[PDB]
Amino acid sequence: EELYYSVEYKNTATFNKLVKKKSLNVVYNIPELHVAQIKMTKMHANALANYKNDIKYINATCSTCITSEKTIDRESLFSRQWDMNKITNNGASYDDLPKHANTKIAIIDTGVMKNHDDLKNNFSTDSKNLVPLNGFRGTEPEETGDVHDVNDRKGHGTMVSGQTSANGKLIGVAPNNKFTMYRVFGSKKTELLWVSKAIVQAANDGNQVINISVGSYIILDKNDHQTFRKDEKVEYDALQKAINYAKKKKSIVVAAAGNDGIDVNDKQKLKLQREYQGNGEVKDVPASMDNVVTVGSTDQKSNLSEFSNFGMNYTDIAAPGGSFAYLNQFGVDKWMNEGYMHKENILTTANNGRYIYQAGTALATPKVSGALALIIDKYHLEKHPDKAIELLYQHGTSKNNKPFSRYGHGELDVYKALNVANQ
């Protein structure tokens, strides 16, 4: 039987010549990162590893590494956006939006309902599909591989897009900015290599803010210097390199903290997310990677959400993503018949053309991406993205002495970020 292997090669020309020689079935490729995915028997994988001149590393593509998203519709009544009110001084910052909304926000996710009334004006036709023909491990025969197909099957990407860009009945953080969707999910799982390719594409398409509202726990064993490996180094290195490539193109990567309420500095707890007893470590990625704005989630009381991961040398900032504390406490019947979803959940755009109440770090993250786009445009920082990040942290966070280990630089404050001239 054949398995899917992640491969990091050394040279395009020599790798291509090797592919011809052995008739390797390459199922995905990312030339900018010298990484490809090959379907082959375990024996041919071992053999392929002996070509030290053309092959750097090889590892089986991780099956159970990506964390599952949440789109379950547990709605009809349309309430107010308490979460936006918390970061805009109760709507006062909408009067301070830049006149020229030039920055484009890329969103790497499940797709988007491009004709949603609140999202259509801001949807960019640069949007692209990174899901390959036949989808995940070739088990989705309905995935044509059509580069223009970014329709949202799962519903998550539409939720995220509303937070950055709704401009109608719902209002996102950057309602005048264009957003670009890079679809990396069909109807099943995604592959971190697709996410990596999406990052490269988003950067090449000139999106100065790149939002990744999904994450995974990956196994990395730095002590192992072998070519054929048991960890997931190819995926780890590819993702980190894509992020650094984005940085090189002057794009900012914003990622969601994991949604397991874990202190990422507690090794025992991280390893438990992959039931890993090996030598290496489990890492929350891309949240913990270099050059990533790591976003945690807060609730309606400005406290860290019970599901938000956090930690020293991890969390950079926090924004409202909601909570299920009332639900988990009282049960669905009392929670629902008594309208608690209107108090602790985030109201957002849904792929049915209407709206949905949800919660998660995936809904906090786009608020920060939107804020960065506003900062870049307000202060004309296109040529100096690091200055936009610095401004976000210094002037785009409320000062309430929240511990840095849980909230990073603080809770997002868009009104403050847009009023630096005011002093």
Least Cβ distance, residue 195 to Ca ion (angstroms): 17
Residue-wise DSSP of 161-199: HHHHH-BSSSB-SSTTS-EEEEE--SSS---HHHHHHHH
CA contacts within 13 A on the Cβ side of 153: 15
Structure token pair of residue 259: 């949604």
DSSP assignment, residue 157? H
Q: What are phi and psi of 350, to 5 degrees?
A: -120, 150
Residue with Cβ nearer Ca ion (343 or 387): 387
Q: How far apart are CA 97 and CA 165, in angstroms?
A: 13
Nearer CB in complex with Ca ion: 247/249: 249
Q: Where are the alpha helices (DSSP H) in 33-130?
A: 42-49, 82-87
Give whichever of 252 and 341 is closer to Ca ion, judged by the CB atom: 252
Closest by CA to 128, choosing from 61, 203, 69, is 203
Residue 290: CB minimum distance to Ca ion, A: 6
Q: Least distance to Ca ion from the beta carbon of 106, Å?
A: 11
**Nearer of residues 176 and 294 to Ca ion, judged by Cβ:** 294
Cα separation, 372 vs 374, whole angstroms: 5
Closest contact distance (angstroms) between CB of 242 and Ca ion is 14
Cβ closer to Ca ion: 109 or 316?
316
Nearest residue (CB) to Ca ion, 12 versus 313: 313
Give one word for 126, left, alpha or beta, with left for phi > 0 and alpha for psi -120 to 50.
alpha
For residue 145, the minimal CB distance to Ca ion (Å) is 27
Interface with Ca ion (CB under 5 A): 249-250, 288, 292, 294, 316
CA torsion, ordered 86, 90, 92, 94, to nearest 10 deg: 70
Nearer to Ca ion, 69 or 316 (CB): 316
Nearer to Ca ion, 162 or 286 (CB): 286
Min dist CB 406 to Ca ion, Å, is 14
CA distance 144 to 141: 7
**Minimum CB distance to Ca ion smaller for 288 or for 365:** 288
CB of 350 to Ca ion, least distance (A): 30
Question: Closest distance between Ca ion and the C-beta of residue 190, in Å?
Answer: 21
Q: Look up residue 315 and give its two tokens.
A: 């969390």
The Cβ-side half-sphere exposure at 51, using a 13 Å CA radius, reads 19
| b/e code 278-309 from CB counts within 10 Å (16+ = b) | eebebbbbbbbbebbbbbbbbbbeebbbebbb
Residue 113 CB, shortest distance to Ca ion, in Å, is 28
Closer Cβ to Ca ion, 97 or 202, answer by number: 202
The neighbour count for residue 15, using CB atoms within 10 Å, is: 21
Query: In whole angstroms, what is the distance from residue 415 CA to residue 401 CA?
Result: 18
CB of 376 to Ca ion, least distance (A): 12
DSSP 415: H
Residue (229 or 283) nearer to Ca ion, CB: 283
Centre a 10 Å sphere on the Cβ of residue 376 and count the other Cβ atoms it contains.
26
DSSP per position, 206-223: T-SEEEE---EEEEE-TT
* Nearest distance, CB of residue 243 and Ca ion, angstroms: 10
